[PDB]
Design a protein around this ligand. Structure first.
Ligand SMILES: *[C@@H]1O[C@H](CO)[C@@H](O[C@H]2O[C@H](CO)[C@@H](O[C@@H]3O[C@H](CO[C@H]4O[C@H](CO)[C@@H](O)[C@H](O)[C@@H]4O)[C@@H](O)[C@H](O[C@H]4O[C@H](CO)[C@@H](O)[C@H](O)[C@@H]4O)[C@@H]3O)[C@H](O)[C@H]2NC(C)=O)[C@H](O)[C@H]1NC(C)=O
Ligand SMILES: *[C@@H]1O[C@H](CO)[C@@H](O[C@H]2O[C@H](CO)[C@@H](O[C@@H]3O[C@H](CO[C@H]4O[C@H](CO)[C@@H](O)[C@H](O)[C@@H]4O)[C@@H](O)[C@H](O[C@H]4O[C@H](CO)[C@@H](O)[C@H](O)[C@@H]4O)[C@@H]3O)[C@H](O)[C@H]2NC(C)=O)[C@H](O)[C@H]1NC(C)=O
Ligand SMILES: *[C@@H]1O[C@H](CO)[C@@H](O[C@H]2O[C@H](CO)[C@@H](O[C@@H]3O[C@H](CO)[C@@H](O)[C@H](O[C@H]4O[C@H](CO)[C@@H](O)[C@H](O)[C@@H]4O)[C@@H]3O)[C@H](O)[C@H]2NC(C)=O)[C@H](O)[C@H]1NC(C)=O
Ligand SMILES: *[C@@H]1O[C@H](CO)[C@@H](O[C@H]2O[C@H](CO)[C@@H](O[C@@H]3O[C@H](CO)[C@@H](O)[C@H](O[C@H]4O[C@H](CO)[C@@H](O)[C@H](O)[C@@H]4O)[C@@H]3O)[C@H](O)[C@H]2NC(C)=O)[C@H](O)[C@H]1NC(C)=O
Ligand code: CA
Ligand code: CA
Ligand code: CA
Ligand code: CA
Ligand code: CA
Ligand code: CA
Ligand code: CA
Ligand code: CA
Ligand code: CA
Ligand code: CA
Ligand code: CA
Ligand code: CA
Lengths: 345, 345
């Protein structure tokens, strides 16, 4: 007897009359995926025996015996089902009623009822793998995942990624971190951090605070990683609990690529960058004059104005002027030499 | 936007970005019969207004407004949904998101989730009509009724009838009742009680104890009733709280028909019957003899033996004998006259 549906009733042969001897009936119950089987009895009147060897109602799956019943509900300290519900672990349940050759006493058999019960994948998933990254939503026959505001559900319909490439660092100094640092970084993400400075600046990179990127003890960064592209060269990949040593580039532009796979709760990383340059030589103020601003050292694009004392003016070639402006160039040289001061005579 | 299924997600236009102005979207959610709609929100960010007149999320049925939401979940003492679930009374739910012409502030809208929820017809049915007579069984998408052991589920798939015609009363006296008397009699049943005595007996009927058959104040027995067929004549129908007066039939056979409809909890009835007959005249013992058994009155089929004293014998015609047997016939006459006793001389 084969049966696939959502509910049903099962009775012993002859019910409500006494069952015949030498009878064996099997009922196979299959429900769709995402459902389990719930079974209970309204009447149970069978012959009692050791391990229910003679007459019995056997409830099982394809590889597991769930329960075996016999005896009469009237007499107690018995192997009867009573008010107990039999729940299948999966979407299949097999029931066998067996009656041997000896039916001296007239037992009336049983009356059973079953139905499909929705599996709540959300309250079992935490004991599994392979569960919703953020939110889990249960429904009749299945489930689905959703994400926190500002996150995007990935192609796996499970993990929550972010858009982390809409950036451009143009300032002389700055801070760059993994998304939500130092909280666990978003899974299944591909972050592109771009540092773009003017021609002549050189970017220095320095990691700080927590550094936590998922790694492997034998294989170099097979899960998550940082790659740093400077010129036609890629540095890394970088991962683990130890940040790479400070990086001094000879470039005004740097690309930081941060890749995260579909697994882990690692805290991420943080770095600070600084745009340096070539150091210009010490400047000596002209006789009867001055140079502003007075700095210990001068770097690329630094501007200085040369001035003279009252009663004197700056002399360029054989031409007089109030101030002259010089700048520290990319190659580490000044735009011009320091001119002299000429009296008003 | 039309949507018929078991689950789903709904977002405001532009989500997760700010919604556009002058927009109006309606989502119609229909589920199969035996299901309701469950609705909740994960994000809600709207403009706040008196009775949500400007921007709003309106949740309604075909004839009833369930809820109206507006405002931002951040600010409290608001008209936001929060963690509250909106449950539809039936299998239909309509949702309208409206945005007016004024979207100065940039509200991010909403994120909603819905699913079909099984109706448990068993826990609401008692507040209805038209419910399971005995047992109610709930399942996903519907329900069904079943009956107590010894009862049969009627063609209405709701009421529980019995087989109450497998009887035959042949004894001189007896008791007949409605099934399970004095407990409520089974609905949708047709009971045939047959009294069959030998030719010459006359059945007398007498109701006793509780008499409770569903009746109507204006119409004679339109629901449940007793009909009594004696010969080619039917007595009744009988119903109500008052039993009919004792019935003296002139018949050895009586049929009692008891009809019960699909409604009520009336206790029923009980009667006792007695098979009478014609009374035979007083018998006088013969001179020098006796008659056994000595009774006050004699009725149909009563047997008596005529005997004589020691030294005498019964005389029939001119023939001597030890005992003579006479019987009380159907017509109220004796089979023979009392013979005399003759000495042994
Ligand atoms: C309704 O559900 C019922 C319950 O699941 C199912 O009934 C059967 O369930 C048992 C498990 O499937 C089954 O027992 C099996 O019998 C196998 C013997 O037959 C196979 O091998 C021979 C050759 O030797 C072939 O000629 C046959 O065609 C057949 O392929 C036996 O090999 C098997 O044992 C192995 O597998 C189990 C898996 O759990 C291992 O634990 C075990 O160690 C072995 O490796 C197993 O015993 C049994 O016959 C039957 N149950 C009863 C009570 O009779 C119904 O078939 C299913 N209905 C439908 C329509 O599919
Ligand atoms: C998706 O579900 C939506 C919500 O139920 C539904 O949208 C509509 O829902 C309202 C109720 O059905 C509807 O309002 C009705 O409008 C009727 C006016 O149009 C009718 O009459 C004119 C002639 O006057 C005809 O030309 C039209 O073709 C049409 O037949 C109006 O008569 C009606 O009011 C009566 O009925 C209600 C019943 O509850 C009584 O309370 C009331 O007293 C009146 O007797 C009612 O107001 C509305 O237009 C619309 N909602 C919105 C927000 O626009 C969708 O139609 C449904 N989708 C599908 C595919 O069916
Ligand atoms: C999260 O993960 C899965 C996988 O990303 C998502 O489900 C997907 O499932 C399949 C692809 O594996 C898609 O189904 C197909 O859609 C086609 C377009 O609608 C349709 O034509 C296909 O039907 C036929 O397919 C073959 C022929 O190609 C044939 O043998 C069949 O008999 C059909 O006639 C088929 O349905 C899904 O579209 C796809 N996406 C979605 C949105 O479901 C899910 O999002 C999700 N899964 C779970 C379980 O959560
Ligand atoms: C308790 O009450 C009802 C009523 O007694 C029970 O359900 C019954 O419902 C209908 C009769 O109203 C039956 O359904 C039909 O069964 C036919 C044989 O299987 C089948 O051919 C029919 O299909 C077609 O019907 C018409 C053509 O005649 C056509 O328009 C349709 O499109 C179909 O193609 C139809 O399904 C049921 O068989 C009947 N009995 C049962 C057991 O369901 C129920 O027992 C119960 N109802 C509830 C809700 O509890
Ligand atoms: Ca057990
Ligand atoms: Ca047995
Ligand atoms: Ca589920
Ligand atoms: Ca963010
Ligand atoms: Ca670790
Ligand atoms: Ca990882
Ligand atoms: Ca409310
Ligand atoms: Ca507005
Ligand atoms: Ca139900
Ligand atoms: Ca009974
Ligand atoms: Ca009453
Ligand atoms: Ca009635």
């Amino acid at each position: 007897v084969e049966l696939n549906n959502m509910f049903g009733q099962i009775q012993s042969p002859g019910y409500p009359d006494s069952y015949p001897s030498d009878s064996e009936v099997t009922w196979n119950i299959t429900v769709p995926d995402g459902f389990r089987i719930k079974l209970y009895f309204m009447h149970f009147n069978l012959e009692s025996s050791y391990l229910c060897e003679y007459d019995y109602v056997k409830v099982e799956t394809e590889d597991q015996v769930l329960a075996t019943f016999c005896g009469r509900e009237t007499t107690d300290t018995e192997q009867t089902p009573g008010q107990e519900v039999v729940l299948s672990p999966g979407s299949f349940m097999s029931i066998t009623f067996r009656s041997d050759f000896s039916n001296e006493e007239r037992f009336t058999g049983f009356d059973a009822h079953y139905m499909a019960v929705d599996v709540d994948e959300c309250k079992e998933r935490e004991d599994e793998e392979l569960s919703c990254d953020h939110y889990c939503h249960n429904y009749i026959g299945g489930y689905y995942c959703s994400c926190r505001f500002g996150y995007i559900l990935h192609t796996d319909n499970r993990t929550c990624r972010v858009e982390c490439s809409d950036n451009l660092f143009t300032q002389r100094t700055g801070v760059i971190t993994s998304p939500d640092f130092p909280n666990p970084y978003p899974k299944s993400s591909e972050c592109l951090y771009t540092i773009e400075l003017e021609e002549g600046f050189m970017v220095n990179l320095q990691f700080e605070d927590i550094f936590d990127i998922e790694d492997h003890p034998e294989v170099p960064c097979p899960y998550d990683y940082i790659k740093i592209k400077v010129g036609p060269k890629v540095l890394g990949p970088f991962c683990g609990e130890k940040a790479p040593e400070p990086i001094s580039t000879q470039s005004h532009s740097v690309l930081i690529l941060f890749h995260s796979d579909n697994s882990g709760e690692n805290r991420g990383w943080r770095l600070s960058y600084r745009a340096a340059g070539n150091e210009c030589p010490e400047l000596q103020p002209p006789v009867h004059g001055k140079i502003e601003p007075s700095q210990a050292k001068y770097f690329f694009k630094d501007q200085v104005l040369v001035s003279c004392d009252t009663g004197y003016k700056v002399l360029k070639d054989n031409v007089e002027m109030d101030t002259f402006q010089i700048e520290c160039l990319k190659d580490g040289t000044w735009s011009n030499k320091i001119p002299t001061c000429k009296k008003n005579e």
